[PDB]
Amino acid sequence: ANDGRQDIFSGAPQPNQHHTLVYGKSYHFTITNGLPEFRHLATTNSGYYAQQRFKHIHGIPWERLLMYVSEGELLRMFRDYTSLKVEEVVCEVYSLGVRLPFVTSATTSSVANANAQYPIGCFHFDEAYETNYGINNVADIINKALGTEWKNATRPTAAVTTAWSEQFPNISASSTSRDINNPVIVDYSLPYFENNVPKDVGIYDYVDIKNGTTAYGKCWEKRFKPTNGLLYAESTLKGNVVTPLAAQPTNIMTPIPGLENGYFMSNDQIRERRDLTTSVPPVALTATKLNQSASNNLNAFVDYMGYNYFGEQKCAPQSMPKFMIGFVNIRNEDNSLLNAKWDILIKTRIRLTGLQSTREWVARTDRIPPQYFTSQYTQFRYPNINETPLLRSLGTFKLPTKRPGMDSRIAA
Amino acid sequence: ANDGRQDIFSGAPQPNQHHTLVYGKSYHFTITNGLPEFRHLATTNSGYYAQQRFKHIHGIPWERLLMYVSEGELLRMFRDYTSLKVEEVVCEVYSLGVRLPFVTSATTSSVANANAQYPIGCFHFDEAYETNYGINNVADIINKALGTEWKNATRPTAAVTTAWSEQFPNISASSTSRDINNPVIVDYSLPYFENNVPKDVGIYDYVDIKNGTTAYGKCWEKRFKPTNGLLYAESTLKGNVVTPLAAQPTNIMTPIPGLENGYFMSNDQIRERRDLTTSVPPVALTATKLNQSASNNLNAFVDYMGYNYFGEQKCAPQSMPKFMIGFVNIRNEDNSLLNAKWDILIKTRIRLTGLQSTREWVARTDRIPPQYFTSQYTQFRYPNINETPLLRSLGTFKLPTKRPGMDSRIAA
Amino acid sequence: YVDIKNGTTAYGKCWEKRFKPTNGLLYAESTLKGNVVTPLAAQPTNIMTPIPGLENGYFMSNDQIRERRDLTTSVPPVALTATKLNQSASNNLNAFVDYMGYNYFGEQKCAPQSMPKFMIGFVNIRNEDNSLLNAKWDILIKTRIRLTGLQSTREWVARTDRIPPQYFTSQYTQFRYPNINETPLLRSLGTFKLPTKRPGMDSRIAA
Amino acid sequence: HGIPWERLLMYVSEGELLRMFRDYTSLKVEEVVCEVYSLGVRLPFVTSAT
Amino acid sequence: LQSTREWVARTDRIPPQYFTSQYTQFRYPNINETPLLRSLGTFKLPTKR
Amino acid sequence: FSGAPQPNQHHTLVYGKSYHFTITNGLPEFRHLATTNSGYYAQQRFKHI
């Protein structure tokens, strides 16, 4: 008790930064009927699949970060932190009615009848069968969500007044109704010469139907709190995007948990590292941001991006449920399809958490401080840190065990 | 009550972003004795001042943002937000003793005596007389605080091993004791030919003395919650640092409060806009970040930077108190000065609040969203938005009414 | 990162550090090797049963994480059944208290976070000419240690002075090489603290 | 400076180490303690080259 | 168990536990190779396996 | 309307048998076994157990 032996000064570092971001958008889309269709798909490496596309069941790409954030806001939040995690995403769907013509006219047709009581519903058979979307289909929905600029932010040499025009090369769906088409596709793998095949998915065992005419307003709302919302993380000393390692591995090495067994879900089956001979299998190494290209960041997914925490099992979590909504096709007397147009409003909300490891790292440059010493984030990439990391399949694949399909764009 | 007349959908924008930053540093400095000295200063525009410098009273530049944040952390926080405000700054001073030699040796002198009971204190006459620091003196303290890098972040062509060396071109005071010298200067303006002058400041009417030998540890702690901690704010549509206006003022104009009367504290007297004929007087216009240069940002002050809120009186607040500490000179038998060396430890803490006006502005580029429509921040600059704004005097001047001295680097 | 005291008045007990190692394993014998010189005589057969393992082949190679296949300079260790006949007499002398490369059968085979370094020192005072004010500090150090020895005599009645191995019911493991006579993964004498706060170790087996 | 309290030889002598290293099937450290006492920090009143 | 929930078979072939989850066995990349068999001699190896 | 798939099947089987065996004495015996891959083992067979 103050015997001249007690501490006089007691230091402590500054804290790490913890920022929380909240963004959101609202859109007005329109979707339409479509009869089911099938085909068989052949791919490289002798891949063969039986495909069934439901042109009347569309999927909202709520897995895409760009559905909540604009390209500008994405660029910023992608450079501001050491690591960025998605805390929660919400997507609400409002129905403004399902209309169709009173009389079909080859020329002057008009969708004036809103009292057809067309059946609409929320499909969710993506939890029992392999599903995916078309790459361009989703790309389209996002381009219409963001829309392309038309204002002359940069004055023309002759900044003269122009004529009014409704011809928006690509106006955002946040300003007006815009058509989108993203039919869900169900795959039935045929890896063997003689395969065991199931009966076509019974969509009626996975749907909640509502009356298209009376269901006016809030219809569905999906929430998702990702287990691994890691969009990115920096834990390397690489202070450039171009520089390669200079030093080779030494004899200094200490055993760490790892928690990566080299097992992957290669389409329909489980494969071990050594068997993936077509493309080079990724490996859980110390994470970096300088691996992803600008265009890759734009296609960021909210549930999993290939990054993991040091103490967790290095692997992909079960992908968030697909948000599929659609019609329940009514057919005419001649069995043809009774076409209808559905107007919906979508609200999107997202909460993220940014971290800046400034506690054990006082930077004297604009370079983001890495989560280096105390702990390290990891990502599925290659010993050559400049090689493209394990990317996320844009087709939003749902592989057996409900995990997100990913590509290994590094040819072996 | 649900008579088919109630709202079906109710939209709302995303929120603005509100981030809070917390940084801090610790330093080890050493200061020494100094007899008081005087001189008369002549400056352009026939300026004449009587100056008295107390070489034994040093000031901690806790007004400087770089005392809390490193150049790297400053760069980042200066580009990340629409506006950044200082919430609070804290500065603690610990004493490790006041030593001096047992016997003065012209050659092998040693500061081995810590039992001289040298008087030390916290001076605060900066609240009664004009005070300021030397530009290079403060610049020096900050360079030693930050220190310059010595690690070869970028490998030499011949990355060979070098010899150990204690010769750090400029090691940070955060790693070792470093000498600093920042004597406080008291000005006695002499604007007229025959001036009314006061007796030299009685420093003993503004000091709290402690026993240098027994005062070991925490001695002083200063806190400051700035009324206007505005480091910067963007409210213009200028999307570049180079572009000038293209459009001239029109006839469209609506009266706003303004709250700027064109009155300045020109040194010792109050002057109205029209009388400041040497340099062009600033004017409270809509704020920008693209006005300040990279080097200006580095010299950012925590209490006032020239930015203000739309609804407040456009002017500078009373500058935060100077943090001046020093010795109470003991003299030898021959009246010479008894030299002593004081070792102190400084802790600095700072809390800031960043804003990103994303509610009424969805950006599609990395350009920071401006606080444009709902309200606008303002700053003391010139109709020509590219002209250097009203800058903060590096000499940390305290003008009558206790306001920070500022420069109008735009020659008239 | 410092707690300062007054060198003149702080006379006596100043600091005390305690550490209860999670893996204080200095060594463990679980092999049937009854010699220090003998090599295996039998090669692996087709008899093999899957065990947990709990070793993923990941190491902290200095500043980064590396997988077994990338450590091409030196041969990466592997968690095999432990032995004492691997360590030399001089190695034993340099034994570390927190981790020596041995692990329990049911735990994740890896190094724990190394015990905190016990660093004490001065806060340099400088003379008027900025030179260093030299000082000499006299300290007294007390050290205490408690260990637990095991002798697996329950399922093994030895008729020689050879220590009974923890063979059947369970087996200890250590980071060494298929060639049981190769020097095991050694502990860096420089007492390195690698990212994630783990002890630096050497793989003295050239590849 | 750092006290090598990570080193077993800081607690046990080479002789005691030799024995405990041959006596068991396995040996585990349960706990290590290290106390530091200060007897003062001294220096010359006047620096003399000799 | 008969995984008939996510698989309506139109043949006598047993429905596989395919999508929601998958069972695993110690065998070889060549699915037709004999899997890891059980020693008929009923061996008890160290660790009692 | 709210659809849902059929369940998976879960069947429980219960079987059992009874036997009448006879066993006899036997002195202990030993040998050494050599196998491929240079395998060598000391064996002790208890003919009464």
Tokens of D11: 């607690």
**CA-closest candidate to residue A101, choices A115, A84, A82:** A115
With contact defined as beta carbons under 8 Å apart, do A133 and A395 qualify?
yes
Helices (H), ranges, A254-409: 294-298
Residue A279 DSSP one-character state: B
**Length of chain C, in residues:** 207
> Across the interface, do B112 and D43 touch by the CB < 8 Å criterion?
yes
Handedness of CA B149, B151, B154, B156 (dihedral sign): positive
Q: Is residue B173 part of a domain?
A: yes
Output the CA–CA distances (angstroms, integers) from residue B292 to B136, B233, B385, C40, D34, in the order listed: 21, 11, 11, 75, 56
- β-strand B283-286 against B378-381: which pairing, if any? antiparallel
Q: Mapping DSSP to helix (H, G, I), strand (E, B) and coil, where does residue C87 land? A: coil
Run of H or E including A137: helix A135-146
Q: Is residue B9 part of a domain?
A: no
State residue A297 phi and psi, 5-degree precision. Answer: -55, -40
Contacts of C129 in chain B (CB under 8 A): 109
Q: Is residue A411 part of a domain?
A: yes
**CA-closest candidate to residue B61, choices B5, B148, B131, B110:** B131
Instruction: Determine whether C129 is exposed, middle or buried from the number of CB atoms within 10 Å of its CB (0-12, 13-18, 19+).
Output: exposed
Tokens of C69: 């296949």
With contact defined as beta carbons under 8 Å apart, do B8 and A216 qualify?
yes
- Return the amino acid letter for B195: N
Tokens of A116: 């057809």
User: Cα separation of A142 and A65, whole Å?
Assistant: 10
**A115 is in which domain, residue-wise?**
14-412
Judge D/E contact: 3 or more CB pairs < 8 A.
Answer: no
Least CB-CB distance to C128: which of B96, B111, B114?
A: B111
Residue with tokens 């204080």: C24
Q: Mapping DSSP to helix (H, G, I), strand (E, B) and coil, where does residue A144 land? A: helix
**CA-closest candidate to residue A267, choices A39, A43, A37:** A43
**Strands (DSSP E) found in C111-197:** 118-119, 136-150, 173-176, 186-187, 193-194
The end-to-end CA distance of chain C, in Å, is 40
User: Cα separation of C96 and A251, whole Å?
Assistant: 19
**Length of chain E, in residues:** 49
Give the CA-trace dihedral at B106, B107, B112, B116, to 10 degrees. Answer: 10
> Across the interface, do D38 and C137 touch by the CB < 8 Å criterion?
yes
Count of CB atoms situated within 10 Å of the CB of A378: 26
**CA-closest candidate to residue A321, choices A14, A60, A67, A74:** A60
> Across the interface, do F2 and A208 touch by the CB < 8 Å criterion?
yes
**CA-closest candidate to residue A118, choices A98, A96, A93:** A98
Q: Is residue A52 part of a domain?
A: yes
3-state helix, strand, coil in chain E (%, to 5): 0, 0, 100
The DSSP annotation for C27-52 comes to EE--S----SSPPP-SPP-S------
User: Cα separation of A318 and D31, whole Å?
Assistant: 43
Interface test with A, best of C6, C60, C117 (most A CBs within 10 A): C60
Smallest CA–CA separation between C111 and chain A, in Å?
A: 5
Tokens of A369: 């401080």
Contacts of F36 in chain C (CB under 8 A): 45
Output the CA–CA distances (angstroms, integers) from residue B173 to B141, B219, C132, D24, in the order listed: 9, 19, 15, 53
Count of CB atoms situated within 10 Å of the CB of A71: 16
The end-to-end CA distance of chain A, in Å, is 69
Contacts of E26 in chain C (CB under 8 A): 50
Q: Mapping DSSP to helix (H, G, I), strand (E, B) and coil, where does residue A212 land? A: coil
**Strands (DSSP E) found in chain C:** 3-4, 12-19, 25-28, 58-61, 64-67, 78-81, 102-103, 118-119, 136-150, 173-176, 186-187, 193-194, 198-199, 201-202
Contacts of A401 in chain E (CB under 8 A): 19-22
User: Cα separation of A34 and B226, whole Å?
Assistant: 64
Handedness of CA B67, B68, B71, B76 (dihedral sign): negative
Judge F/D contact: 3 or more CB pairs < 8 A.
Answer: no
User: Cα separation of B85 and B230, whole Å?
Assistant: 4
User: Cα separation of B223 and D18, whole Å?
Assistant: 61
Chains that touch E (3 or more CB pairs under 8 A): A, C, F
Q: Is residue A129 part of a domain?
A: yes
Portion 1-49 of F in contact with C at CB < 8 A: 35-40
Q: Is residue A8 part of a domain?
A: no
Q: Is residue A9 part of a domain?
A: no
Residue with tokens 């006047």: D46
User: Cα separation of C166 and C151, whole Å?
Assistant: 8
Our count of domains for chain A comes to 1
Least CB-CB distance to D33: which of C144, C148, C150?
A: C144
Contacts of E19 in chain A (CB under 8 A): 128-130, 400-402
User: Cα separation of A297 and D32, whole Å?
Assistant: 50
Q: Is residue A184 part of a domain?
A: yes
Least CB-CB distance to D21: which of C16, C92, C102?
A: C92
Chains that touch B (3 or more CB pairs under 8 A): A, C, D
- β-strand A17-32 against A178-179: which pairing, if any? parallel
User: Cα separation of B119 and B125, whole Å?
Assistant: 18
Nearest CA in chain E to A192: E31
Tokens of A94: 């409002």
Judge F/C contact: 3 or more CB pairs < 8 A.
Answer: yes
Question: Is A243 touching C (CB cutoff 8 A)?
Answer: no
User: Cα separation of C117 and A365, whole Å?
Assistant: 30
